[PDB]
Amino acid sequence: MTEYKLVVVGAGGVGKSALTIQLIQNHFVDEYDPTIEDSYRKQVVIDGETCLLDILDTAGQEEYSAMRDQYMRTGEGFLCVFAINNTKSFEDIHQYREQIKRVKDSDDVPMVLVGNKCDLAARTVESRQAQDLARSYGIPYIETSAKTRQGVEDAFYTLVREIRQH
């Protein structure tokens, strides 16, 4: 009944899990428990199509990243997440995109660049920098807050709409 396999990747602590939990369970996770690998499933209607989202939430911490490449292999589309108050996480996006291209053996994989924690005032990554990166990659850039839920549905549904153009 139409399934989309989405994978969420990016540096430790940027909010991958909080984003996923906000989408699937409609609440904010305030605490930080590092992820190894977790999956979620939810039936939703997107643009008039009932479908099943399978979301793989991956490790950002190098210590918990064992076998992440094996899980990413099945993904149909990827959210590449950084946090707008974490310059390193933005600088490291290229690594995740490279890893995606490797595991998929393609330079044409559906992706969305996500700048999370947009509720925070200590911004060090400006919108324009991220837009430029996204433009060079040929993908959309969307800002989100897992805390307020702003942009969360848009980020994931946009990724579905990208998969649908493939």
List contacts with Ca ion (CB under 5 A).
Answer: 28, 30, 102, 105
β partners of residue 67: none
Nearer to ligand GNP, 15 or 110 (CB): 15
Q: How many CA atoms lie within 13 A of 142 on its CB side?
A: 21
Footprint (CB under 6 A) of ligand GNP, residues 128-157: 145-147
Q: Which of 4, 12, 80, 82 binds ligand GNP (CB under 6 A)?
A: 12
Backbone angles phi, psi at 31, to 5 degrees: -85, 165
| Minimum distance, C-beta of residue 33 to Ca ion, in the bound complex (Å) | 12
| Minimum distance, C-beta of residue 69 to Ca ion, in the bound complex (Å) | 8
Give the Cα separation of 74 and 71 in Å (integer).
6
| Minimum distance, C-beta of residue 57 to Mg ion, in the bound complex (Å) | 6
Q: Which residue has the tokens 């369970």?
A: 25
Give the Cα separation of 58 and 65 in Å (integer).
8
Angle at 91 between CA 67 and CA 138, to 5 degrees: 85
- What is the per-residue binding string for ligand GNP in 94-133, x denoting contact by CB under 6 A? ----------------------xx-xx-------------
Q: Which of 17, 22, 86, 116 binds Mg ion (CB under 5 A)?
A: 17
β partners of residue 80: 9, 113
As annotated, the binding site for GTP includes: 13-18, 29-35, 59-60, 116-119, 145-147
